[PDB]
Design an enzyme around this catalytic site. Structure first.
Site, PDB file in Angstrom:
ATOM      1  N   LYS D 154      -4.382  -0.440  -1.225  1.00 36.06           N
ATOM      2  CA  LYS D 154      -3.497  -1.198  -2.117  1.00 36.06           C
ATOM      3  C   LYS D 154      -3.920  -1.113  -3.584  1.00 36.06           C
ATOM      4  CE  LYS D 154      -4.320  -5.060   0.097  1.00 36.06           C
ATOM      5  NZ  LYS D 154      -5.026  -4.618   1.314  1.00 36.06           N
ATOM      6  N   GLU D 180      -9.049 -11.780  -6.012  1.00 43.64           N
ATOM      7  CA  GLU D 180      -9.637 -10.480  -5.666  1.00 43.64           C
ATOM      8  C   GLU D 180     -11.050 -10.303  -6.222  1.00 43.64           C
ATOM      9  OE1 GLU D 180      -8.855  -8.244  -3.339  1.00 43.64           O
ATOM     10  OE2 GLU D 180      -7.326  -9.673  -2.654  1.00 43.64           O
ATOM     11  N   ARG D 181     -11.544  -9.067  -6.301  1.00 40.85           N
ATOM     12  CA  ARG D 181     -12.940  -8.826  -6.670  1.00 40.85           C
ATOM     13  C   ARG D 181     -13.141  -8.900  -8.182  1.00 40.85           C
ATOM     14  NH1 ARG D 181     -11.311  -5.425  -2.815  1.00 40.85           N
ATOM     15  NH2 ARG D 181     -12.392  -5.717  -0.800  1.00 40.85           N
TER      16      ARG D 181
HETATM   17  N1  LIG Z   1      -5.608   7.393  -2.619  1.00 48.08           N
HETATM   18  C1  LIG Z   1      -6.873   7.389  -2.121  1.00 48.08           C
HETATM   19  N2  LIG Z   1      -7.622   8.507  -2.081  1.00 48.08           N
HETATM   20  C2  LIG Z   1      -8.879   8.508  -1.593  1.00 48.08           C
HETATM   21  N3  LIG Z   1      -9.494   7.424  -1.093  1.00 48.08           N
HETATM   22  C3  LIG Z   1      -8.851   6.230  -1.078  1.00 48.08           C
HETATM   23  C4  LIG Z   1      -7.481   6.144  -1.607  1.00 48.08           C
HETATM   24  N4  LIG Z   1      -7.072   4.865  -1.454  1.00 48.08           N
HETATM   25  C5  LIG Z   1      -8.103   4.185  -0.901  1.00 48.08           C
HETATM   26  N5  LIG Z   1      -9.159   4.997  -0.680  1.00 48.08           N
HETATM   27  C6  LIG Z   1     -10.438   4.576  -0.083  1.00 48.08           C
HETATM   28  O1  LIG Z   1     -10.226   3.313   0.560  1.00 48.08           O
HETATM   29  C7  LIG Z   1     -11.017   2.305  -0.079  1.00 48.08           C
HETATM   30  C8  LIG Z   1     -10.199   1.027  -0.090  1.00 48.08           C
HETATM   31  O2  LIG Z   1      -9.099   1.156  -0.996  1.00 48.08           O
HETATM   32  P1  LIG Z   1      -8.600  -0.161  -1.762  1.00 48.08           P
HETATM   33  O3  LIG Z   1      -7.489   0.242  -2.696  1.00 48.08           O
HETATM   34  O4  LIG Z   1      -9.770  -0.914  -2.327  1.00 48.08           O
HETATM   35  O5  LIG Z   1      -7.997  -0.976  -0.484  1.00 48.08           O
HETATM   36  P2  LIG Z   1      -7.258  -2.423  -0.519  1.00 48.08           P
HETATM   37  O6  LIG Z   1      -7.077  -2.804  -1.966  1.00 48.08           O
HETATM   38  O7  LIG Z   1      -5.969  -2.219   0.226  1.00 48.08           O
HETATM   39  O8  LIG Z   1      -8.228  -3.298   0.218  1.00 48.08           O
HETATM   40  C9  LIG Z   1     -11.305   2.859  -1.473  1.00 48.08           C
HETATM   41  O9  LIG Z   1     -12.474   2.334  -2.102  1.00 48.08           O
HETATM   42  C10 LIG Z   1     -11.426   4.341  -1.215  1.00 48.08           C
HETATM   43  O10 LIG Z   1     -12.752   4.622  -0.773  1.00 48.08           O
HETATM   44 MG   LIG Z   2      -7.680  -4.437  -3.209  1.00 48.05          MG
END
Ligand SMILES: Nc1ncnc2c1ncn2[C@@H]1O[C@H](COP(=O)(O)OP(=O)(O)O)[C@@H](O)[C@H]1O
Ligand SMILES: [Mg+2]
Ligand SMILES: Nc1ncnc2c1ncn2[C@@H]1O[C@H](COP(=O)(O)OP(=O)(O)NP(=O)(O)O)[C@@H](O)[C@H]1O
Ligand SMILES: [Mg+2]
Lengths: 54, 487, 466, 467, 255, 128
Positions: D154, D180-181
Site C-alpha cells: 500500500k 502509521e510509522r
Molecule cells: N512495488 C514493489 N516492489 C518491490 N517490493 C515491494 C513493492 N511493494 C512492496 N514491496 C515490499 O513489501 C514491503 C511492504 O510494502 P508496504 O508498502 O510497506 O506495505 P503496506 O503499506 O501495505 O503494509 C516493502 O517494504 C517492500 O519490501
Molecule cells: Mg503502509
C-alpha cells in the site's frame, strides 16, 4: 493388447480418482460446516461478553 | 409539563435519553429545542430513548423536547416524478419545493391476503437473461444479490431505463413508475446515477429517494419505507410502480447501530431479533391488487450485498427467504466475460412463466432446458477430446446460448428483439459460428432486423407467439445474414 | 384485572398490575386501539410487572395505557366452523367472511398428552399414494419432513393428502402457515378453492387455514404453529379423528422462537439459536401424537440452513421426524408425478416388526431393483442395452416399469389434467409391486404402468394400447 | 467555563462542569500541563458531566484537575502558511520551525457537501503504472482506495503515486499520516525536501503535512484524518483549486474509534467494532470529495485486517470509492509487484465510452484470460499439463506472461528490487498487453516479461537471457 | 538510554504473544470490556507504542539507535490471523518461520515469499547489495515456477536455468546454529552462487562445498576478505580475485 | 440402591447429548459464560460425576456393582466434537456405530476398529 490394457487401466484409475475426490468433497464439506458453526458462535460470544461487561 | 414536553437527561451517539414526555406514543416524532427531530423508539419507565435525526452537537443535557402533533409521513404523488428527495421527501436537487397535494405515513400495513390477485403481468427488465430465465411479474419481490462490484445496481438501472418504451407509448396498462431508494451510498455515486437516468430520459418517470452515508442512521432506516409509501400511491390508484431498495444491507446496518446504542439485545452478527421483521414488513408492501382495488401493483427489487459469496449470512438469509426469487451475481462470471454476471443455474423466479408473454415463454423454455443439459457436461468441455457426437453438440449449443445471454449496459431490449435473438440460438443457426463472434453477430443482426424488418418484429409482438410465417421469415433472414457475416 | 403499560421496546411490552398478576402465557388485551393488540405474558419481572411479547405492531402505544388481563392464554375458535376459513394467531378471521361461529374456544398452550394417554402401537396412516405408502409410509401420529420447495408439485401433494385422509380415514386437516408469504398464502387459498378441498358454498371444506405471515412480529410467527395445532387437537380429542396438520415451515417456527428469545435478552446458544431450542420444539412436537382417542399426523416442510444437516435447527427437528417425503426436480422432469424420490424418501416404520414382513420384503425389493438399475445406467451409456446378461436385461425392464407404477394420477388435479384421480389401498400397492418383481408382467409394455392406479389398470391400459 | 476531571481510564476522561456544559465536539483545554492537552467532548452523561476523548496521553492527570471549555471544536491553521509545514491533530507545528502564521483557522468538524454540490466529470489520470492504467484507471478529482493486508505494498504504491503524479502537479497537495510509522513520516519529509516540493528556505512549497502516527493514543489517531481533510477543504474551496489528498492509512481512523468504544459504553457490533462504524466513516468520507467549487483527487491507503476483505472496516470503505486497487499477499508472495489483484480491482471510468473501446477491450481480454487461467490452475495442478488442448495451454502460457508483464519496477522500490524504476505511458501499456493477447510473443520465455517497463524491454530481456 | 546517548542497542521481546495475554488478563480484571478474541480493543496500540520507540536518531540527537526484534507465536502456521497481522502492521518487516520448511531441512526455516524487510538494501553494505540485490524477488519467482513445473515435462531453457539457480541458492541460505557469519564471508559464499559458478554442482554437495570453500578463503585469502570488509564492497579487483578462487577451487572440489 | 446392597444393576442414559443440551439451556438462562459450542465449562463435570458412580464394589462393600451404558449422539460421525470427547474421556471404552455400516445393512453397525472395552476382557468368559 497394449491399448486394451491401457484404456481399461485409465478407466479404473479415473474411476478410482473420481471416487476419491468424491470422498474428499464429503469430508471437506463436514469440516466446512463445523468451522462455519464455530465462527458464528465465536463471533456471538465476543459480542455478548463485550455487552455483559458494560 | 412533563406530559407533553421532556428534558434531555443524556445525549451521545445519536441517542437522547429524555426525562418526561409521559404522553409520547411509541415511534412518535418529537422535537428538540434546536429544531432537530427525533423518534421515540424506547419508552422506558424513567426515560424515553430518542433516536436523533442529525448532529448530536446541537443537543445538550437539559434541552427541552416537545411533542408537536407530528406524524411520520411523506409527500406522495406524481409531483415527486423527476425529483431527487431525502428520506423525508425534502427536495435535495435544488429545484424548489415538491408541489405535493397529498401525503402518506411511511409506516403502514401491507395489503392482506384478500385484496390481492396472482402476479400475472410482465415486469420487463429488457435484460435478456432475466426476462427469459428469471422473469419478473408486476407485484413480485425479486432480490438482486451478490458480492460488491458484481453489477447489482446496473440490473436495476437498466430495468428503470427500459420502461421509457412503455411510458412513452399509448397503453396505460403497460406504464411503470420507478422509484430508486439509495441507502448509505455516497452522494457523488447517487449524482452519477441520476445523470445516467437523466441522459437516458428516464428521470421524468423516476423518483430518487436518497439517504446517503453522512445522513444519520434513523434517516437511512426510514428511506426504504418512505420510497415504499410513494410507490403505494401508484399501487392504490390503479397504476403500477417499481421500487429499488439499493441497498438493504446498508439499511440493516443503520438499524443495528440504533438498536445496539439503545442497548437492545444483540444476536447473530450483533443484529437484533426484529431485523427480519424490519425487512419483511417492507417487502410485503409490494403487492398485486385485485380489480376491486383498482388493479394496481408495486414491484420491488431489493438489493443485498454478500461478503465472499456467503448467501447464508444473517441478512441475506432473511431477504432471500422473504422474497419471491433471486438474481444471483458472481465475480468469476463477470471476469470470464459473462456480463450481466447472472448465475442462471442458481437464479430463481417462483412466479416464473406466469410473468412471461407467450413469445418469450416459448424460446426461454427451450433455452432453459438446453442450458441445463450444457451445465451437466460443462466441466468436460476443456478436457473433452474424444466425446461422442451428442455431448459435443450439448457443449456447442451451450456456449452459444451463453454468449447470447451476454448484454451491454444501458441498452435494454424490447421483448420481441429478445425473442428474435434467442431464436437464432435455440434453432441452431449459430451452432457452427465461432463463439467469439456471437456478440458481434447479434449486434449487427439486431441492427438489421430493427432497420429492415420492423414488420416482422411487430408480428412477433402482436401474434403473442412465433407463427409459421414468422418462423419462415426468420429462417431466411438468419441463414442469408449469417452467410454474409461469415463471407 | 386492569394493568398499565410501563415500557414499550419494539415488540416487548411491560405492563404493571395493581392486584393479582396474569400468569406466564396469559393473553392481555390492550385497550384503546383500532385493531386487537394481544400481548402474551413471558415473564414476571418482580415489582408487580410482567414482560410480554406483542402479537402485532406496537407503534402508538403510550405509557399508562390500559391493558386487560383475559384470565387465560390466547383462546381461539375450534370446531367444524374453522374448516374452509382462514384465521390468524389470535383466532380472528382474515378471509373477510365474517365471524367464526364456533361454540367452543380453546387455549393455544396445552401440555402434551400424558404417558398413560399414549398409544403403544405404531400403525401406518395409509395415504393412498403408492410411493409413500410402499417405500416411506407415514406413521399415525408421526412427523414427516417434506423436502423440495417450488416447482415439484408440493401444494398439489398437500392438497391430495388432505383429500385422501378425509376420504380414507374421515379425518380433517389443518394447514399452519408459519412465516407465510402473503402472495403465496393468497394463491394457496384459491388453489384450495379450485381443487375443492375448500368449499365456499357449502360445509364440505376439509381444511382449516391458519396464517402467521412474514410481516407479523416474532411472537405471532412463533405462536401460529400452536394455534394451528390447537385447531387440529379439537378434531383428535373431541371428535376422535385421525387428523392432518401441515406446518409450513418448521425452520421458520424455530427462527421465530430465536427472534423472540433475542428480544427477551436471553443469551443465544450455538450458531445463534435460542438456548431453549430443544424445549421450544419439544413442547410443540409432543402435542402431535396418537392418543387413545385419536391422532394428529404432521407433514412439516423443512428448510436446511446452509445445506447443513448438522445445523442445530434441522438436527433438533430430525429428532422428531418418523419419515421424509423428498420431492425432486429431477424426478419431475422425468414426468413422474408425484415427484417423490423413491430412494431418497425414508421411513422409520419401514420395519418388518411394524408394517409386516411382506410389506417390508416388497418395499426392500423395489429399493434394491431401483438401486441396481442405477448401477447399470453407466454401462448402458457405454456398452448398450443389448450387451446385458439375461438377468440384467430383466432388471432394467422391471425397474423401469416399477419407476412408472410409482407414479399416480391425483384427484385434486382432475381439473388441470382431465384424468381421474386414484386412491390406492395399501394391499393393492403391495400386490402391484409384488407382481412386477416376480416377473408377472414382463410381457406388458413399459408405458402401461405410467399414470395408473391399481395394477389391473396397467393391464387394462396395456390392452387399450392396441 | 471551568470544569474538573472526575474520572480517567486510558484515553477517556470524564469532566464535571458546574455552570455551562460544553456541547459535544467541543475542544476542552486541560490546565496544569506542560504541553497542550485537549479533550474532545463525546457525550453528555447527565448530572453535569461530559465524557471526552483525549488528544494526547492522560498520564499525570489527577481527579479534580481543572479544564477550560474553549468554546468551539478543535480549530486548526488552514491556508498557504500550512505549505511545507508539519502539523499535528490539533494544528500545532511539529517540524520545529516555529508558529504557523495563518490569517485563518478552521474547525476539524464540518458538514459534508450537499448533493447539489456534486460534480459528475471524470477523466483519466494516467499513473504510468501498467496494471492501474490498464485494468482500473484513476480519475482526476476521483476517490481512489488502495486496499491491502499488512505488508503487501500500500505505502510503496502511494509513494510511487506521489512520485509520479504529485511531483509535477500544478496545484497543492496534502499528505495525512494517520496511525502509521513515524519512520515513514521522516522518510517522506526529507524525500520531499530533496525533490523540492517542500522548500524550507522560500515560499514555493506545494505540500502540507499532517501527522498523528501509531506512537499516538487513540484520540489523536481518530481525529488526525479530519485535521488533514480540513486543510485540503480550505485549498479546495478558498482557492477553488486542484488538490491532491494522500491519506495513509484511513483504516486507523476506524481502528482508533474501536479502541475507545467500550469505554464510551457501546455494546460491540460484529468483529469487535463500534456500532457506529459506518456513520462515523460516512460523515468523514463525504467531506473527502470534489465539489463544484474545486477538485480533490483523493488517494487513501486502506488496511485489511487479517487479510480479510470482508472485515467491516474495509468492507464498509469500498462504496466510498471511484477506483479501487486491491493488493494481494498471494500475489506479493510470488514476487509480483505491485501486488495488484487484476480480478478484484475496479474503476468507475472502466467503460468504452470513457476510456475508448480499444482500452476497454484490451482490459477485459486481459481479465478474461487471467480468470480462465485461474479456473484451470488447481485442475491442471493435479491432472497434469499434457491433458490440455493445444489452444488451452496457449491461454496458460499467455496468461502467465500477462501476470508478469503486470509487474513493474517502481522508482520508490529500487531499495527492494535492485532494478531501476520504470514509468509506462498509457498507449504503450495498451499496445503491450494487446500484442501478447494476439500471440505476438508466444516464442519469448515467461521470465522476459517479469519486472520490466514497456514491451520492448521484455524483448530485450529475452535476448539477455539467451546468453 | 543508549539510543539517546550516541550508542546503539538491540532489544528482543520474547515474546509479545505472552505479553498480550497478560495485558488481556489485566484489562479483563479491571472490568474493561473485551473486544475481538477477548483481547482489549486497543491491543494494536499496546504493541504499536512499544515498537515505535525503536528508532534511528539524527546527528543532532546523537546519532544513536534502538533496533527491535519482537517475537510472535502463531497457531497452526497462520500468519494471516488477527494478532499476527496487528504486529506485522507495526514492524519494518517480518521473518516468518514454518515447521514444514524446518523438517524438510530448510533451517533457518524462513519462508522467503512471506518474509520482508521494509528498509531493504539501505540496511546492507554495498558488497552484500552487490550479491543479494535481486535475489529475493528471484527466489519468489523460482518457488512459483518450481511448483508450476511439478509435472516434469519439456521445460524451456529459461525456466530450467531459473530452477537450477533456485535449488542451489536455497542450499546456500541453509545455516547451522551458534556460528553467526562475518559479512564478508556471507558475501563470498553468496557470490559463488548468484554468479552461477555452482550451477553444475550437484545440489546435495553445496553445503559440503561452502564449508570447504570458506575454510579455504579464510586461511588462504584473508587479504581479499579483509579488503571486502574494509572497503564495504566488491571492487573490480576483488571480483577478479574471487572468480579465480571459486572456479579453480570448485574444479578441485569436484575431482 | 442395588450397587451398595450386594446386588447388580445396569443403567442406560438415553441419552447424554440431550441432557447436556438441557443443561446448556439452564446455564445460558442463568447467564453463565458460554464456551466451546456455547456449553458451560462444567459440562464435562456434569457427566463425569454421574458416570463415576457406576462402579464395581469389592467383597468388603458387599460385592455389588452398577454398570452404566451412556448414549451419545454424534453429528455426521464427528467423534472429535466437545461432548463426545468429554464422554469418551470418562467411560471405559466405546461402542461406535457407523451410519455407513448401518445403511449397508451390517447390523449391529459396530465399527470394530473404533470400538474398545478398556477393562472388560478380564470379565469375559473363557469359552468366549
Ligand atoms: N512495488 C514493489 N516492489 C518491490 N517490493 C515491494 C513493492 N511493494 C512492496 N514491496 C515490499 O513489501 C514491503 C511492504 O510494502 P508496504 O508498502 O510497506 O506495505 P503496506 O503499506 O501495505 O503494509 C516493502 O517494504 C517492500 O519490501
Ligand atoms: Mg503502509
Ligand atoms: N452488462 C454489463 N456489461 C459491462 N459492464 C457492466 C455491466 N453491468 C455492470 N457493468 C459494470 O460493472 C461495474 C459494477 O456495476 P454496478 O452496477 O456498480 O455493480 P454493484 O454490485 O452495484 N457495485 P457496488 O454497489 O459498488 O458494490 C460497473 O463499472 C459497471 O459499469
Ligand atoms: Mg451498486
Amino acid at each position: 493388447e497394449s491399448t486394451t490394457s491401457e484404456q481399461s487401466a485409465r478407466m479404473t484409475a479415473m474411476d478410482n480418482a473420481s471416487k476419491n475426490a468424491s470422498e474428499m468433497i464429503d469430508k471437506l464439506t463436514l469440516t466446512f460446516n463445523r468451522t462455519r458453526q464455530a465462527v458464528i458462535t465465536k463471533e456471538l460470544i465476543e459480542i455478548i461478553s463485550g455487552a455483559a461487561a458494560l | 409539563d412533563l406530559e407533553e414536553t421532556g428534558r434531555v437527561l443524556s445525549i451521545g451517539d445519536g441517542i437522547a435519553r429524555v426525562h418526561g414526555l409521559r404522553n409520547v406514543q411509541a415511534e412518535e416524532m418529537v422535537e428538540f429545542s434546536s429544531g432537530l427531530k427525533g423518534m421515540s423508539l424506547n419508552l422506558e419507565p424513567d426515560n424515553v430513548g430518542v433516536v436523533v435525526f442529525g448532529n448530536d452537537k446541537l443537543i445538550k443535557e437539559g434541552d427541552i423536547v416537545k411533542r408537536t402533533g407530528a406524524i411520520v409521513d411523506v409527500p406522495v404523488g406524481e409531483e415527486l416524478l423527476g425529483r431527487v428527495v431525502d428520506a423525508l421527501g425534502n427536495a435535495i436537487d435544488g429545484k424548489g419545493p415538491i408541489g405535493s397535494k397529498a401525503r402518506r405515513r411511511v409506516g403502514l400495513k401491507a395489503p392482506g391476503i384478500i385484496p390481492r390477485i396472482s402476479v400475472r403481468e410482465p415486469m420487463q427488465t429488457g435484460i435478456k437473461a432475466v426476462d427469459s430465465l428469471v422473469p419478473i411479474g408486476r407485484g413480485q419481490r425479486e432480490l438482486i444479490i451478490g458480492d460488491r462490484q458484481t453489477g447489482k445496481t446496473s440490473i436495476a438501472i437498466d430495468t428503470i431505463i427500459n420502461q421509457k418504451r412503455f411510458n412513452d407509448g399509448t397503453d396505460e396498462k403497460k406504464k411503470l413508475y420507478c422509484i430508486y431508494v439509495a441507502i448509505g451510498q455516497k452522494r457523488s455515486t447517487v449524482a452519477q446515477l441520476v445523470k445516467r437516468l437523466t441522459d437516458a430520459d428516464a428521470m421524468k418517470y423516476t423518483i430518487v429517494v436518497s439517504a446517503t452515508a453522512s445522513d444519520a442512521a434513523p434517516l437511512q432506516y426510514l428511506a426504504p419505507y418512505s420510497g415504499c409509501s410513494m410507490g403505494e400511491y401508484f399501487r392504490d390508484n390503479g397504476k403500477h410502480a417499481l421500487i429499488i431498495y439499493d441497498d438493504l444491507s446498508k439499511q440493516a446496518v443503520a438499524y443495528r447501530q440504533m438498536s445496539l446504542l439503545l442497548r437492545r439485545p444483540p444476536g447473530r452478527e450483533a443484529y437484533p431479533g426484529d431485523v427480519f421483521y424490519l425487512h419483511s414488513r417492507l417487502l410485503e408492501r409490494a403487492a398485486k391488487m385485485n380489480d376491486a382495488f383498482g388493479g394496481g401493483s408495486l414491484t420491488a427489487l431489493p438489493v443485498i450485498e454478500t461478503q465472499a459469496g456467503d448467501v447464508s449470512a444473517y441478512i441475506p438469509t432473511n431477504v432471500i427467504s422473504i422474497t419471491d426469487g433471486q438474481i444471483f451475481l458472481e465475480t468469476e462470471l463477470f471476469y470470464k466475460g459473462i456480463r450481466p454476471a447472472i448465475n442462471v443455474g442458481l437464479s430463481v423466479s417462483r412466479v416464473g412463466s406466469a410473468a412471461q408473454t407467450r413469445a418469450m415463454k416459448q424460446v426461454a423454455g427451450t433455452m432453459k432446458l438446453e442450458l441445463a443439459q450444457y451445465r451437466e457436461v460443462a466441466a468436460f468441455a476443456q478436457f473433452g477430446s474424444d466425446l461422442d457426437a451428442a455431448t459435443q453438440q450439448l457443449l456447442s449449443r451451450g456456449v452459444r446460448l451463453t454468449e447470447l445471454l451476454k448484454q451491454g449496459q444501458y441498452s435494454p431490449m424490447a421483448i420481441e428483439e429478445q425473442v428474435a435473438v434467442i431464436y437464432a440460438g435455440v434453432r441452431g443457426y449459430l451452432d457452427k459460428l465461432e463463439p467469439s463472434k456471437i456478440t458481434k453477430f447479434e449486434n449487427a443482426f439486431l441492427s438489421h432486423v430493427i432497420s429492415q424488418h420492423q414488420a416482422l418484429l411487430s408480428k412477433i409482438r402482436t401474434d403473442g407467439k412465433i407463427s409459421e410465417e414468422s418462423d419462415a421469415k426468420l429462417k431466411e433472414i438468419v441463414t442469408n445474414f449469417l452467410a454474409g457475416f461469415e463471407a | 384485572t386492569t394493568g398499565r403499560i410501563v415500557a414499550v421496546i419494539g415488540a416487548v411490552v411491560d405492563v404493571q398490575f395493581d392486584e393479582g398478576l396474569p400468569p406466564i402465557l396469559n393473553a392481555l388485551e390492550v385497550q384503546g386501539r383500532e385493531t386487537r393488540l394481544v400481548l402474551e405474558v413471558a415473564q414476571h419481572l418482580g415489582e408487580s410487572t410482567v414482560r410480554t411479547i406483542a402479537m402485532d405492531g406496537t407503534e402508538g402505544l403510550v405509557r399508562g395505557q390500559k391493558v386487560l388481563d383475559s384470565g387465560a392464554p390466547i383462546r381461539i375458535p375450534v370446531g367444524p366452523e374453522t374448516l374452509g376459513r382462514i384465521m390468524n394467531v389470535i383466532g380472528e378471521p382474515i378471509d373477510e367472511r365474517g365471524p367464526i361461529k364456533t361454540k367452543q374456544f380453546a387455549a393455544i398452550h396445552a401440555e402434551a398428552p400424558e404417558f398413560v394417554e399414549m398409544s403403544v402401537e405404531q400403525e401406518i396412516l395409509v395415504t393412498g399414494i403408492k410411493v409413500v405408502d410402499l417405500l416411506a409410509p407415514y406413521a399415525k401420529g408421526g412427523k414427516i419432513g417434506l423436502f423440495g420447495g417450488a416447482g415439484v408439485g408440493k401444494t398439489v401433494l398437500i392438497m391430495e393428502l388432505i383429500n385422501n385422509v378425509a376420504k380414507a380415514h374421515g379425518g380433517y386437516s389443518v394447514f399452519a402457515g408459519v412465516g407465510e408469504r402473503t402472495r403465496e398464502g393468497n394463491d394457496l387459498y384459491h388453489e384450495m378453492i379450485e381443487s375443492g378441498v375448500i368449499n365456499l358454498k357449502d360445509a364440505t371444506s376439509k381444511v382449516a387455514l391458519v396464517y402467521g405471515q412474514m410481516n407479523e412480529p416474532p411472537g405471532a410467527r412463533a405462536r401460529v404453529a400452536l394455534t394451528g395445532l390447537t385447531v387440529a387437537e379439537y378434531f383428535r380429542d373431541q371428535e376422535g379423528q385421525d387428523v392432518l396438520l401441515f406446518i409450513d415451515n418448521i425452520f421458520r417456527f424455530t427462527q421465530a422462537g430465536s427472534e423472540v428469545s433475542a428480544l427477551l435478552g436471553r443469551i443465544p446458544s450455538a450458531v445463534g439459536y435460542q438456548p431453549t431450542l430443544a424445549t421450544d420444539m419439544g413442547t410443540m412436537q409432543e402435542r402431535i401424537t396418537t392418543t387413545k382417542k385419536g391422532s394428529i399426523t404432521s407433514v412439516q416442510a423443512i428448510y436446511v440452513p446452509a445445506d447443513d444437516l448438522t445445523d442445530p435447527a434441522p438436527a433438533t427437528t430430525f429428532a422428531h421426524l418418523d419419515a421424509t417425503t423428498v420431492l425432486s426436480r429431477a424426478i419431475a422432469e422425468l414426468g413422474i408425478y408425484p415427484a417423490v424420490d423413491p430412494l431418497d424418501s425414508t421411513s422409520r416404520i419401514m420395519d418388518p416388526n411394524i408394517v409386516g414382513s411382506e410389506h417390508y420384503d416388497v418395499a426392500r425389493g423395489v429399493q434394491k431393483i431401483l438401486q441396481d438399475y442405477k448401477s447399470l445406467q453407466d454401462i448402458i451409456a457405454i456398452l448398450g442395452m443389448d450387451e446385458l446378461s439375461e438377468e440384467d436385461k430383466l432388471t432394467v425392464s422391471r425397474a423401469r416399469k416399477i419407476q412408472r407404477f410409482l407414479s399416480q394420477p391425483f384427484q385434486v388435479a382432475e381439473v388441470f389434467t382431465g384424468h381421474l384421480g386414484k386412491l390406492v389401498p395399501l394391499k393393492e400397492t403391495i400386490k402391484g409391486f409384488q407382481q412386477i418383481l416376480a416377473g408377472e408382467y414382463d410381457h406388458l409394455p413399459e408405458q402401461a404402468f405410467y399414470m395408473v392406479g391399481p395394477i389391473e389398470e396397467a393391464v387394462a391400459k396395456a390392452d387399450k394400447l392396441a
